[PDB]
């Protein structure tokens, strides 16, 4: 299990983060998103509610994991360790490649 | 245009005596701008209060903001709590 | 630097006098912003090729 340091403060997110889609490597807590502490450049449309909990038995591939996999492939173009940790680190390289194919 | 500014600050004096209601770090977090209060998250996209059709000076004091926010009716919620057990 | 705080979770039915942990504090009221949502951008803006 990873830890997700909330951006714009130092807090730890409990079980729900809010991923940003234009800086693409930030997160937020719920309370910093309810009040709008994420800077006047962003617009509260580009924040997807992602979870942090360990999901169910493998080879289910919820839409959160598919989205983060495709975010990783748009990020790195290679480097399947850096894809598999960005999925969440509870999936192997040899399964992320078997799911993208 | 930078991204990685700090935009939160902490004062050194521990004033943590009457502060259990604010947002604590775990001290008190002090941001660089205020908060934003949003009444209702979901817009109600039809409703000629908002859609403004082109057919046919009048005022109307509607009850609350809850008209504009897609609330479910209670008979469905009782039906679903009956389906609970 | 001119800082700000979070929203106090004091209810609307509290009626107590306003206590202050510091007398160098000040208090302000936040007017909620409310109108037809400004036209959000399309999904081509949110998630283009980088």
């Amino acid at each position: 299990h990873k830890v997700y340091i909330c951006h714009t403060c130092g807090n730890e997110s409990i079980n729900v983060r809010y991923h940003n889609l234009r800086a693409r490597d930030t997160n937020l807590c719920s309370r910093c998103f309810q009040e709008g502490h994420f800077g006047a450049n962003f617009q509260s449309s580009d924040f997807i509610r992602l979870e942090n909990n360990g999901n169910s038995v493998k080879k289910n591939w919820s839409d959160q994991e598919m989205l983060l996999l495709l975010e990783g492939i748009e990020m790195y173009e290679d480097q399947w360790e850096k894809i598999a940790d960005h999925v969440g680190g509870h999936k192997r390289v040899e399964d992320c490649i078997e799911k993208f194919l | 245009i930078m991204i990685d500014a700090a935009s939160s600050f902490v004062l050194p004096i521990s004033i943590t005596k009457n502060v259990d209601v604010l947002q604590r770090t775990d001290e008190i977090l002090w941001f660089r701008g205020p908060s934003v209060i949003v009444n209702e998250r979901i817009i109600n996209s039809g409703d000629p209060h908002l859609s403004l059709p082109l057919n046919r000076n009048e005022k109307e004091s509607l009850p609350g903001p809850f008209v504009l926010g897609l609330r479910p009716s209670a008979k469905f919620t009782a039906h679903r709590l009956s389906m609970l057990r | 630097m001119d800082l700000f705080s979070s929203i106090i979770s004091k209810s609307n039915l509290d009626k107590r006098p306003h206590e202050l942990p510091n007398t160098n504090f000040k208090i302000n009221n936040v007017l909620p912003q409310t109108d037809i949502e400004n036209e959000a951008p399309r999904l081509g803006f949110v998630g283009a090729n980088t």
């Binding site: 299990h1 990873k2 830890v3 997700y4 340091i5 909330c6 951006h7 714009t8 403060c9 130092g10 490597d25 930030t26 997160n27 940790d85 960005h86 680190g89 | 990685d4 700090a6 939160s8 600050f9 902490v10 004062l11 050194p12 004096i13 002090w30 | 630097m1 800082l3 510091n22 160098n24």
Partner: peptide
């Protein structure tokens, strides 16, 4: 009180993204 410069909390972007939570993989004595 007006001479009380505040402490910035820096986020350090690589810490915000994916930090996990070595002898506990027993291959190194």
């Amino acid at each position: 009180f007006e001479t009380m410069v505040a402490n910035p909390i820096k986020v350090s972007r690589l810490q915000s993204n994916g930090v996990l939570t070595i002898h506990y993989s027993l291959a190194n004595f």
